[PDB]
Amino acid sequence: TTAAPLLALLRENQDSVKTYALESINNVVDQLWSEISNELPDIEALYDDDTFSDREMAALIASKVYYNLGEYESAVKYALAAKDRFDIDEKSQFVETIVSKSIEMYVQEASKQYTKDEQFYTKDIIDPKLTSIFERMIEKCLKASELKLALGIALEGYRLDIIESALKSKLDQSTSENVKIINYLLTLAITTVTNSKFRSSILRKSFDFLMNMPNCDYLTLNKVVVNLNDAGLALQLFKKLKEENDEGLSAQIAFDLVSSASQQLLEILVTELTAQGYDPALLNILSGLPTCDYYNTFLLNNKNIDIGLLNKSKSSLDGKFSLFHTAVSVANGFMHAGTTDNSFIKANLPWLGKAQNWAKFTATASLGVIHKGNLLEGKKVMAPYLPGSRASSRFIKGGSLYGLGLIYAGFGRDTTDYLKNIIVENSGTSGDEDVDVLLHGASLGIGLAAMGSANIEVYEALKEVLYNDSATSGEAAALGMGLCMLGTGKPEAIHDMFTYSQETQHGNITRGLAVGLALINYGRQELADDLITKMLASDESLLRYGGAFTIALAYAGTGNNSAVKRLLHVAVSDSNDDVRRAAVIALGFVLLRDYTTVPRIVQLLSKSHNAHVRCGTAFALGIACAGKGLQSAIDVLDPLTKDPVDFVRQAAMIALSMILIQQTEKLNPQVADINKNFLSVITNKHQEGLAKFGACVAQGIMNAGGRNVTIQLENADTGTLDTKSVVGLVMFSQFWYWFPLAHFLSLSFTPTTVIGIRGSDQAIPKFQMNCYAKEDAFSYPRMKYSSKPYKVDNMTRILPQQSRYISFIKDDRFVPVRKFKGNNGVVVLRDREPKEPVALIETVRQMKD
Amino acid sequence: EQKIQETELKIRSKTENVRRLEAQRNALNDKVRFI
Amino acid sequence: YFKLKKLEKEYELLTLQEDYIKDEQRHLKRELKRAQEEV
């Protein structure tokens, strides 16, 4: 029984007697181990003895000693030494810890050797003592019908054999089981797998299971194509639509891919798809024609500007230079965005004449936000100010070429050849200041039209503008080249534009180059660290400004603790208020995924002696919390509203305007205090100048698009980071430093509508749902789950957040599929009985085509 | 499922370490409001 | 399955606040230098 004398008798002869001696020891291994541990070195010495054949049973004894000694690493070695006595299926606290310890050490070596070889799990690169328990644990979880621990550990183990082989045996094909399995693999691996190559294969292997399209989830396969940006998988989706013929399923795939894909993937869906055959109904869909048509028509049906509250805002004073006129013009241009209403410019004469020279840019560019989405008459709005028709002056003429950039952005291939010809004419030299103004709006318009597509002609045309060292259009040339270099970009253009920033020192140039060097690196993560190190080591104020946005864009989406430590040390050690403001704003772009921890960090930075630090955290809080929940961020911005600093209250009103969209009517109790401050701060002369100027746009953002459009960034509809939405918010960070850039914000405003259309072509009918919904669209600025139906759930405005409780009635000619898919841009639900009257109403969308 | 629970217990232990930040932040705000 | 996802999400707060309390001490040292100038 007592193992103390037996362990000392193992140095004698007759090894057959030692077999019987070890039998009585296995009882006290969990009892006397604190005593017999003095004889433990004799147990380990016999394992290496070639004449000792009892190591099979001797390994079990030593496995329970070192473990209870407090060494978890040793318990794995002695347990797998024999590879026989160890039983993983036995349920005890001794085995479960050894299994969890072997997996923990296996993840550390899996994240390293994966770079050299991806086949390491099939090879000897890893010592089998790590993979022995790791393989037996997965097989034990598969027999227990538990996919939480099996799939969760597989993502940490970085092994492709587990997910690929086990999924084939677990196939239940309802057919909704395989959809949730990938959803558990997609959601967890993003915050777990640190290597973009491993998660690239997980989405690729899952494509071969659903490739047959047995009424499976297309949104799951769409997120695979968008994340991988593969041209072969995008074309393969339409290859299966030719075999299985469905008008409803093939449509929803086409509307979804055109919005989330970049300019490079749209060429495969149009040019490459035409060569291999296509659907005549789906060709125009992938070209973006219906996408812009839905945004313009849905806003025109229900439109409330409420000019009564706006008249009192813009009639206060004619002075304060353009800062008052710019505030009311940029704000009003948001309310009519997409509805094509010129009443501010046309119906009101005096507010246009009171503007200054450079102030006429906002009055002209306001129509670009208003008429955004018009691919036909968008040029006729700027027709009198186009080149060759001259203009009232050359300061206002430059805004016309920029107005075409906001409307046609991404569709501006026709204007791409038109806008670059004006740059070549002015590329020689400039004799006047307003000449660069015409080049300023031209370079920004072609940058938006070519945004997302790499063009060597636009890069070389704007490169000659940088050589001229223009104090006005110098930033426009840098921003135009950065939008073409979005994504991986050109590595040669990284060091070239960085060299011109050190050679040419200018405020409007280098600052634009610093932002341009941030746009060229998008989603590169550690690949952009070479440029980040050069900016952090330099003491230049403008180079440190672009260093934060370079970290913001590359490290966005999935959060990274390495990018947090960089932005935190810069906002503290550096004494520059503009750089501290850029570091706290750059933190919000990395936190876009998790909006719950964003206010907690802002509360820590809400108390500071610097105004720019509190001003940066104000707008950075509203970036991630715009279209998300957690209404408590309003109370965080309350003390910033009382800040005597002028520009802090300006960014505070804008941040409040982003979170409070559609929060009225007994949703957020703070909507009463924000609506009073609209007319109170403007009319009162005791407040700050920039405070009332920001309250104008603050009232204009909540009323933008006629109370309809909302700011959607990193949602379930897109599936990834929106390129147009993240760039527009960066431009807002520069307001009074040079000239308001707020016109770029129009890319983030999208309406909220739910409509089925048809299964073939454009319809926009009129029907009713009557499902549980909050009261929003019928609550406009004036002069508990009860399962109770709402007035009309079709179209209107409402809210995307609380619309998850809205169902779809099946009593009409349509049928529900996703049970409120909840996608406002894609829409186009399934029609089970086409060619039947829907009570269709033809919209004005023909004018936008 | 015990591997996740035992690991989560460390977060609750480090939660009391976050309490040390409130003592330093309030002492820092007293110096900020003073200057 | 939320216990696995929310597990690694809480370390982001422990990562920032670990070096953030150290920045308050560096700021406190700067306030002491400003306090000597006030005298």
Coordinates of C-alpha atoms in Angstrom, one line a residue, chain A residues 139-411:
Chain A
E139 CA -12.8 13.7 -31.5
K140 CA -14.2 13.5 -27.9
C141 CA -16.2 16.8 -28.5
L142 CA -17.6 15.5 -31.8
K143 CA -19.0 12.4 -30.1
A144 CA -20.6 14.6 -27.5
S145 CA -22.6 16.6 -30.1
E146 CA -21.0 19.9 -28.8
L147 CA -19.9 22.4 -31.4
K148 CA -19.1 25.2 -29.1
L149 CA -15.9 23.8 -27.6
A150 CA -15.0 21.8 -30.8
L151 CA -15.2 24.8 -33.2
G152 CA -13.9 27.3 -30.7
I153 CA -10.7 25.4 -29.9
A154 CA -10.2 24.6 -33.6
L155 CA -10.0 28.3 -34.4
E156 CA -7.3 28.7 -31.7
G157 CA -5.4 25.6 -32.9
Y158 CA -5.0 26.9 -36.5
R159 CA -5.8 23.5 -38.0
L160 CA -7.6 23.2 -41.3
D161 CA -8.3 19.4 -40.9
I162 CA -10.7 19.9 -38.0
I163 CA -13.2 22.3 -39.6
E164 CA -13.1 20.7 -43.0
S165 CA -13.4 17.0 -42.0
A166 CA -15.8 17.3 -39.1
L167 CA -18.3 19.6 -40.9
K168 CA -18.9 16.9 -43.6
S169 CA -20.1 14.4 -40.9
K170 CA -22.2 17.0 -39.0
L171 CA -24.2 18.1 -42.1
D172 CA -27.9 18.1 -41.3
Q173 CA -29.0 18.9 -44.9
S174 CA -34.9 23.5 -42.9
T175 CA -31.2 23.6 -44.0
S176 CA -30.6 26.3 -41.3
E177 CA -28.0 24.3 -39.3
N178 CA -25.1 24.8 -41.7
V179 CA -25.8 28.6 -41.7
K180 CA -25.3 29.0 -37.9
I181 CA -22.2 26.8 -37.9
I182 CA -20.4 29.1 -40.2
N183 CA -21.8 32.1 -38.3
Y184 CA -20.1 30.7 -35.2
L185 CA -17.0 30.2 -37.2
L186 CA -17.1 33.6 -38.8
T187 CA -17.9 35.6 -35.6
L188 CA -15.4 33.9 -33.3
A189 CA -12.4 33.7 -35.7
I190 CA -12.4 37.4 -36.4
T191 CA -11.7 38.3 -32.7
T192 CA -9.5 35.1 -32.3
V193 CA -7.4 34.4 -35.4
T194 CA -4.7 37.0 -35.7
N195 CA -3.5 35.7 -39.2
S196 CA -5.4 36.9 -42.2
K197 CA -4.3 33.9 -44.2
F198 CA -5.9 31.3 -41.9
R199 CA -9.3 33.0 -41.8
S200 CA -9.0 33.4 -45.6
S201 CA -9.0 29.6 -45.9
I202 CA -11.9 29.1 -43.5
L203 CA -14.2 31.2 -45.7
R204 CA -12.8 29.5 -48.8
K205 CA -13.4 25.9 -47.6
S206 CA -16.9 26.8 -46.5
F207 CA -17.7 27.9 -50.1
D208 CA -17.5 24.4 -51.5
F209 CA -20.2 23.1 -49.1
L210 CA -22.9 25.7 -50.1
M211 CA -21.7 26.0 -53.8
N212 CA -24.7 23.8 -54.9
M213 CA -27.1 26.5 -53.5
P214 CA -29.7 24.2 -51.9
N215 CA -31.8 27.2 -50.7
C216 CA -28.9 28.1 -48.4
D217 CA -27.7 31.4 -47.1
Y218 CA -26.3 33.7 -49.8
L219 CA -25.3 36.4 -47.3
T220 CA -22.8 33.9 -45.8
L221 CA -21.3 33.4 -49.3
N222 CA -21.4 37.1 -50.0
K223 CA -19.3 37.9 -46.9
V224 CA -16.7 35.4 -48.2
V225 CA -16.4 37.2 -51.6
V226 CA -16.2 40.7 -50.0
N227 CA -13.6 39.8 -47.4
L228 CA -11.4 37.8 -49.8
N229 CA -12.0 40.2 -52.7
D230 CA -11.6 37.2 -55.1
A231 CA -12.7 37.6 -58.7
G232 CA -13.2 33.9 -59.1
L233 CA -15.6 33.4 -56.3
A234 CA -17.7 36.5 -57.4
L235 CA -18.1 35.0 -60.9
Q236 CA -18.8 31.5 -59.4
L237 CA -21.9 32.8 -57.6
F238 CA -23.5 33.6 -60.9
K239 CA -22.3 30.3 -62.5
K240 CA -24.7 28.5 -60.2
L241 CA -27.6 30.9 -60.9
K242 CA -27.6 29.7 -64.5
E243 CA -28.3 26.1 -63.5
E244 CA -30.8 26.7 -60.7
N245 CA -33.2 29.4 -62.0
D246 CA -34.7 31.7 -59.4
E247 CA -35.5 35.3 -60.0
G248 CA -35.8 36.2 -56.3
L249 CA -32.5 34.6 -55.1
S250 CA -30.4 35.8 -58.0
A251 CA -31.6 39.4 -57.5
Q252 CA -30.8 39.7 -53.8
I253 CA -27.2 38.5 -54.5
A254 CA -26.8 41.1 -57.2
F255 CA -28.0 44.1 -55.2
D256 CA -25.8 43.0 -52.2
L257 CA -22.5 42.5 -54.1
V258 CA -22.5 45.8 -55.9
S259 CA -22.6 47.9 -52.7
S260 CA -20.0 46.1 -50.7
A261 CA -17.5 45.5 -53.5
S262 CA -14.8 48.0 -54.5
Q263 CA -14.3 49.4 -57.9
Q264 CA -11.9 46.6 -58.9
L265 CA -14.5 43.9 -58.2
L266 CA -17.2 45.8 -60.1
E267 CA -15.2 45.3 -63.3
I268 CA -15.4 41.5 -62.9
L269 CA -19.2 41.7 -62.3
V270 CA -19.7 43.7 -65.5
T271 CA -16.9 43.4 -68.0
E272 CA -15.8 39.8 -67.1
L273 CA -19.3 38.6 -66.5
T274 CA -20.4 39.8 -70.0
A275 CA -17.8 37.5 -71.7
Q276 CA -19.0 34.4 -69.9
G277 CA -22.7 35.2 -70.1
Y278 CA -25.0 37.1 -67.8
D279 CA -28.6 37.9 -67.0
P280 CA -30.0 41.0 -68.8
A281 CA -32.0 41.9 -65.7
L282 CA -28.9 41.5 -63.4
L283 CA -26.5 43.4 -65.6
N284 CA -27.8 46.9 -64.8
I285 CA -28.1 45.9 -61.1
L286 CA -24.3 45.2 -60.8
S287 CA -23.6 48.5 -62.5
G288 CA -25.0 50.4 -59.6
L289 CA -28.0 51.9 -61.5
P290 CA -30.8 50.7 -59.2
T291 CA -28.7 51.4 -56.0
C292 CA -28.7 55.2 -56.6
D293 CA -32.3 55.1 -57.9
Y294 CA -33.6 53.6 -54.6
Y295 CA -31.9 56.2 -52.4
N296 CA -33.3 59.2 -54.4
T297 CA -36.9 57.9 -54.7
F298 CA -37.4 56.7 -51.2
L299 CA -36.5 60.1 -49.8
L300 CA -38.9 62.0 -52.1
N301 CA -42.0 60.1 -51.0
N302 CA -41.7 61.0 -47.3
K303 CA -39.8 64.3 -47.0
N304 CA -40.1 66.8 -44.1
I305 CA -37.4 69.5 -43.9
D306 CA -39.3 71.7 -41.4
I307 CA -38.0 75.0 -42.8
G308 CA -39.9 76.9 -40.0
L309 CA -37.1 76.1 -37.5
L310 CA -34.5 76.6 -40.2
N311 CA -35.7 80.1 -41.1
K312 CA -35.1 81.4 -37.6
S313 CA -31.5 79.9 -37.7
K314 CA -30.3 81.5 -40.9
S315 CA -32.0 84.8 -40.4
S316 CA -30.1 85.7 -37.2
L317 CA -27.3 87.8 -38.7
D318 CA -25.6 88.5 -42.1
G319 CA -22.2 89.0 -40.6
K320 CA -19.5 86.7 -39.1
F321 CA -18.1 86.3 -42.6
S322 CA -18.9 82.9 -44.2
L323 CA -18.8 80.9 -40.9
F324 CA -22.5 81.7 -40.4
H325 CA -23.3 81.2 -44.1
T326 CA -21.3 78.0 -44.4
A327 CA -23.0 76.6 -41.3
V328 CA -26.5 77.1 -42.7
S329 CA -25.6 76.1 -46.3
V330 CA -23.9 72.8 -45.4
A331 CA -26.7 72.0 -42.9
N332 CA -29.5 72.7 -45.4
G333 CA -27.7 70.7 -48.1
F334 CA -28.0 67.6 -45.9
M335 CA -31.8 68.0 -45.4
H336 CA -32.4 67.9 -49.2
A337 CA -29.7 65.3 -49.9
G338 CA -31.0 62.9 -52.5
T339 CA -34.3 64.7 -52.9
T340 CA -32.9 67.2 -55.5
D341 CA -34.3 70.4 -54.0
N342 CA -32.5 73.7 -54.8
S343 CA -34.9 75.9 -52.8
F344 CA -32.0 77.1 -50.6
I345 CA -30.0 78.4 -53.6
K346 CA -33.0 79.2 -55.9
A347 CA -35.9 80.3 -53.8
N348 CA -33.7 82.4 -51.4
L349 CA -31.8 85.1 -53.2
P350 CA -30.1 87.1 -50.3
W351 CA -28.2 84.3 -48.6
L352 CA -26.3 83.6 -51.8
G353 CA -25.2 87.1 -52.4
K354 CA -23.9 87.7 -48.8
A355 CA -21.2 85.0 -49.4
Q356 CA -17.5 85.8 -49.9
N357 CA -15.3 84.6 -52.7
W358 CA -14.2 81.2 -51.3
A359 CA -17.6 81.0 -49.6
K360 CA -19.3 80.4 -52.9
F361 CA -17.8 76.9 -52.8
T362 CA -20.2 75.8 -50.1
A363 CA -23.3 77.2 -51.9
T364 CA -22.3 75.4 -55.1
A365 CA -21.1 72.2 -53.4
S366 CA -24.3 72.0 -51.4
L367 CA -26.2 71.0 -54.5
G368 CA -23.7 68.1 -54.9
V369 CA -25.0 66.7 -51.6
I370 CA -28.6 67.5 -52.5
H371 CA -28.5 66.1 -56.0
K372 CA -26.2 63.1 -55.1
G373 CA -27.4 60.0 -56.8
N374 CA -28.5 61.6 -60.2
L375 CA -26.5 60.0 -63.1
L376 CA -28.5 61.9 -65.8
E377 CA -29.4 65.5 -64.8
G378 CA -26.5 65.9 -62.3
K379 CA -24.5 67.6 -64.9
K380 CA -27.3 69.9 -65.9
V381 CA -27.4 71.4 -62.3
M382 CA -23.8 72.6 -62.7
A383 CA -24.3 73.4 -66.4
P384 CA -24.1 77.2 -66.1
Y385 CA -21.0 77.0 -64.0
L386 CA -19.2 74.4 -66.1
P387 CA -16.1 75.4 -68.1
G388 CA -17.0 77.1 -71.4
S389 CA -20.1 78.7 -69.9
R390 CA -17.9 80.9 -67.6
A391 CA -19.6 81.9 -64.4
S392 CA -20.3 84.9 -62.1
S393 CA -16.6 84.5 -61.0
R394 CA -13.8 82.0 -61.0
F395 CA -14.2 81.3 -57.2
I396 CA -17.7 79.8 -57.7
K397 CA -16.7 78.0 -60.9
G398 CA -14.4 75.7 -59.0
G399 CA -17.2 74.4 -56.8
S400 CA -19.1 73.1 -59.9
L401 CA -16.5 70.6 -60.8
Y402 CA -16.5 69.4 -57.1
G403 CA -20.3 69.1 -57.1
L404 CA -19.9 66.4 -59.9
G405 CA -17.5 64.5 -57.6
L406 CA -20.0 64.1 -54.7
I407 CA -22.8 62.9 -57.0
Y408 CA -20.9 60.7 -59.4
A409 CA -18.4 59.3 -56.9
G410 CA -17.5 55.8 -58.1
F411 CA -19.7 56.2 -61.2

